[PDB]
Amino acid sequence: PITGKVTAVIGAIVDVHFEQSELPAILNALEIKTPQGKLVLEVAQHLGENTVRTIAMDGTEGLVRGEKVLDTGGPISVPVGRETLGRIINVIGEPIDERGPIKSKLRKPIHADPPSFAEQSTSAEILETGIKVVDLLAPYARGGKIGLFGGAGVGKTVFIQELINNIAKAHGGFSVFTGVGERTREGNDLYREMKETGVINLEGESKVALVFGQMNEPPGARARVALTGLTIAEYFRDEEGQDVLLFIDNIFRFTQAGSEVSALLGRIPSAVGYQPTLATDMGLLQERITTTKKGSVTSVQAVYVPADDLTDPAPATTFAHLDATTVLSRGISELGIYPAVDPLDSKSRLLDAAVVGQEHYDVASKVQETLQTYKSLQDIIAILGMDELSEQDKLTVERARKIQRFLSQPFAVAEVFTGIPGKLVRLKDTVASFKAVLEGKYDNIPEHAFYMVGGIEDVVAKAEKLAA
Amino acid sequence: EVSSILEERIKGVSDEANLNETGRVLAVGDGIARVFGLNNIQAEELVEFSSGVKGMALNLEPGQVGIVLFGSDRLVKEGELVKRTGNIVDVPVGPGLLGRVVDALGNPIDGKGPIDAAGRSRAQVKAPGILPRRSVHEPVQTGLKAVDALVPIGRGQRELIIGDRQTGKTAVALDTILNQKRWNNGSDESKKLYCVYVAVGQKRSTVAQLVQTLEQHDAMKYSIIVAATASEAAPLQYLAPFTAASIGEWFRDNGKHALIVYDDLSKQAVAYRQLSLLLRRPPGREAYPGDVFYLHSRLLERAAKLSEKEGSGSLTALPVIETQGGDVSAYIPTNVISITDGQIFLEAELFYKGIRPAINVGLSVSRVGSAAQVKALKQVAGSLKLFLAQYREVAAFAQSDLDASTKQTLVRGERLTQLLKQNQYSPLATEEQVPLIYAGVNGHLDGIELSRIGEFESSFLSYLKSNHNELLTEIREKGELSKELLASLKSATESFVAT
Amino acid sequence: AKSAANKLDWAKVISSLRITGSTATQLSSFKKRNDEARRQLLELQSQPTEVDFSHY
Amino acid sequence: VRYEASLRQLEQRQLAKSVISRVQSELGNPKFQEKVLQQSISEIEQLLSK
């Protein structure tokens, strides 16, 4: 056997001395018997002569040196199946929703390798979203990273609730929402709402699976929660060919967590207080988001600022890998736009013309252009007077204000919030609707008739009713 | 059954000889296996592990030999044998790597065929002598109206490609790849530049897409994708341009050239940085290695135009840096600026303002390399560079007089600025640059309005390619601007302004 | 079929103008449009019965 | 088609544990004594030719 007694506890960095000629491998999971259960510590270096140096994942309240250790022989393995959907699971894969033990099918290590060069996104293609705004100005792809911007309460919670609904309708797909630096008090509030709104049902099958980052637990476990979720998504992807959505909260706490563990391992943190392994830690996580031969994960990550700037090492490295931005703004949410997306900072580089179609590109560029001309003229027009308008100008004022209102689409999930039963609007209906406003066939139609409506079909009704 | 044939391979290998020197892994950690032993070993020699993880001898110490693991710490553990492989890093070279998507061992990650190759050459090789070179006088055309005017590049010279992230940094280059569709296709060997493209530190999806981009434009078969992936360790993100270069040295020394497309040298510097701070190599200037200077120059000084004392090729060396949000007075791009002559920058301004190529002339300093320009283009690109130096100075007037400054090279300015905007994935041959540009130079786009620029340019190109096909031929194949143009090609231009 | 439904419908509104009452034109118009529109989206989705067994 | 494409890869997986099962079979049978000796006489022959 490979067993060894604990011989140090500097920090939460536990050095365990093993029997002569037998020692673990790096990235192994060690199990330590205690009056607290177990501590699952993950080996990150050998010191040699059958000694190791590990990191902690479960908290450390004090440890008697002379405790027995058991080497499992490989990395910590988290459950997979449709028996884990709708249950909050910690880093080692155990319930923290307190509905007590949960069933499982297979267990699979949280470290897996990027898929082959055969099983890649060799072609960008469009993943349809229930939100018309998304589908125009930054349409979603398959094996894509789409980086959400802004904080929490900025329109954040509703954007996330909608997506979980869309995917399921769209294919029959699932989600796993991971939160890193999720506050334990707030996560309860969210879980209670998610249950009410039908994105967590209490059957064995649900939509979204929840994986949460407990800040009262070590830094190693903040960093590894991300990989715990990635693994459940990947099973669905590999063996049932389901398309999934893996959400992250703070990618800020991913970086903070990861640095603390380097610092603890002695690897020099210089270059703006960030770890040297920054590029590769990302590279591993994000190359496991790809299209294979059956399934394709697709990912919404959230960027949250690290010292009131974006020039710092952690944003830049996140950004490089990105392919779209969706830019939720609190100001825009206060004006009662759902989605809260800022329609001039929503961008995609998969908005080419042979990926998205030649037509979809034309509609979308005019939409940007119309609002861009509108906002700039309005600056000095407001002040000087709105009787200083030209014939050219007031066609633009007309088109822009009517488009802006039209952006507000209730969602089924935010039915309570917005006040209207939700809509879902798909790739055909985004082009057709926004196209018509451009040819000004719906400029004889009030603005209270573009409020809380979806694509072209829906808005026919409103024009009649306003008058009635 | 596939298994019998595979099982059978493993059986042939079963009977192994004496290990030349046997290290033992004392400990492992920092990605640096601390391998005891290997008493007599060459410095930085490649090694393999009996695990099947290869590394090489990065630290050489009196009683110990640190190995940089290329492979993982998962599969390495203490005790394990570390077999002398005996070679210092060498690379498979010559053709057979064409159509191939490859890594730093020069082995395929497309998975198409085996790499077969005619011989191997060292990955560290040093620069050619002073006299075994000659100056450049041979045009890198790139297929760009704009960039071939401002600074076309010498065949053999390093010139910094810089400019911001995704500003058409990945995009604009496929134009150059498609330019070899004119030249590398053709039997003449001083027009062969094999398309030694690289992907240091780019994600698997991006790389995956990139291959089929080159298959779609069908330049792929004469190109290479000397890739590296941001998921896996520093030695790949280190050895990949050197690998690429050795490929280029083979062609280069045979009289064929390599078009060597060094993307992304910023990843390499980051890998370098990272490996310093991993292995406790002390944080230099701005916490970036001390020797990242020596790393970029060691690679880029390889580049020359050879005379005829070593062959006739060249290493057409394109040091692509991709800047993270500007900051060009950082240590990595200041060093690179000095190591290179002139420069090329594309802008987060212009590109997202909807003018692409996004170039600014100031941040693209003309120096040595526009002497390699062929006459016809040079005659009107010289004029252009002045007129745009004016457009700049004339734009920057607010600290109108209605004169030669404030209207004329405002107009001629705006006009040529719009003319130059190019939708990508198009080669433009050398006779489809100058007659257009020439028209702005005589101010025959001054009648033309900011719409009509391409209606002009395109209807002019059609009217040219019906009645002046011979003149187009003389412009690209004499490479000259001749008296017969200064008549009929100018007469063409003048006739076409109205009609 | 459908095209007749919508053109005569919109026409009768500008006719209600020539008289008095025109406020239950708006309910007549809404009803007829809506269910025409419900059958129209089904008709364009249309595919006859199908599964493949010689392409797979 | 999704399972059929899984099934190609899957075939190697079913076979793999079968290789493993034969190793356990080897180490239980006196293939454990006798083949360990076979290597040994090849090793003598190899070591001699140096």
PDB file of all heavy atoms in Angstrom, chain B residues 481-491, unseen atoms left out:
ATOM      1  N   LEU B 481       6.958  51.314 -65.164  1.00  0.00           N
ATOM      2  CA  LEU B 481       6.113  52.361 -65.635  1.00  0.00           C
ATOM      3  C   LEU B 481       6.918  52.992 -66.767  1.00  0.00           C
ATOM      4  O   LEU B 481       8.059  53.455 -66.533  1.00  0.00           O
ATOM      5  N   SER B 482       6.345  52.928 -67.991  1.00  0.00           N
ATOM      6  CA  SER B 482       7.002  53.140 -69.285  1.00  0.00           C
ATOM      7  C   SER B 482       6.281  54.222 -69.877  1.00  0.00           C
ATOM      8  O   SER B 482       5.189  54.543 -69.434  1.00  0.00           O
ATOM      9  N   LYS B 483       6.833  54.871 -70.943  1.00  0.00           N
ATOM     10  CA  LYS B 483       6.480  56.050 -71.639  1.00  0.00           C
ATOM     11  C   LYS B 483       5.115  55.860 -72.295  1.00  0.00           C
ATOM     12  O   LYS B 483       4.355  56.812 -72.333  1.00  0.00           O
ATOM     13  N   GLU B 484       4.794  54.646 -72.860  1.00  0.00           N
ATOM     14  CA  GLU B 484       3.629  54.117 -73.483  1.00  0.00           C
ATOM     15  C   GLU B 484       2.421  54.113 -72.522  1.00  0.00           C
ATOM     16  O   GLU B 484       1.257  54.177 -72.970  1.00  0.00           O
ATOM     17  N   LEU B 485       2.649  54.134 -71.218  1.00  0.00           N
ATOM     18  CA  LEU B 485       1.655  54.379 -70.195  1.00  0.00           C
ATOM     19  C   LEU B 485       1.316  55.807 -69.854  1.00  0.00           C
ATOM     20  O   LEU B 485       0.163  56.247 -69.756  1.00  0.00           O
ATOM     21  N   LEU B 486       2.406  56.542 -69.719  1.00  0.00           N
ATOM     22  CA  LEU B 486       2.392  57.997 -69.520  1.00  0.00           C
ATOM     23  C   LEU B 486       1.619  58.707 -70.701  1.00  0.00           C
ATOM     24  O   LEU B 486       0.995  59.772 -70.438  1.00  0.00           O
ATOM     25  N   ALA B 487       1.535  58.025 -71.890  1.00  0.00           N
ATOM     26  CA  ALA B 487       0.435  58.171 -72.834  1.00  0.00           C
ATOM     27  C   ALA B 487      -0.825  57.364 -72.457  1.00  0.00           C
ATOM     28  O   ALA B 487      -1.661  57.860 -71.698  1.00  0.00           O
ATOM     29  N   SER B 488      -1.009  56.101 -73.020  1.00  0.00           N
ATOM     30  CA  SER B 488      -2.274  55.448 -73.080  1.00  0.00           C
ATOM     31  C   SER B 488      -2.862  55.094 -71.720  1.00  0.00           C
ATOM     32  O   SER B 488      -4.105  55.107 -71.635  1.00  0.00           O
ATOM     33  N   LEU B 489      -2.055  54.715 -70.724  1.00  0.00           N
ATOM     34  CA  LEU B 489      -2.624  54.349 -69.397  1.00  0.00           C
ATOM     35  C   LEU B 489      -3.140  55.552 -68.688  1.00  0.00           C
ATOM     36  O   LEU B 489      -4.202  55.454 -68.040  1.00  0.00           O
ATOM     37  N   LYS B 490      -2.446  56.739 -68.885  1.00  0.00           N
ATOM     38  CA  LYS B 490      -2.948  58.005 -68.370  1.00  0.00           C
ATOM     39  C   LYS B 490      -4.142  58.423 -69.174  1.00  0.00           C
ATOM     40  O   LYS B 490      -5.150  58.812 -68.539  1.00  0.00           O
ATOM     41  N   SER B 491      -4.095  58.309 -70.556  1.00  0.00           N
ATOM     42  CA  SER B 491      -5.253  58.619 -71.397  1.00  0.00           C
ATOM     43  C   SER B 491      -6.476  57.855 -71.065  1.00  0.00           C
ATOM     44  O   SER B 491      -7.607  58.379 -71.054  1.00  0.00           O
TER      45      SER B 491
END
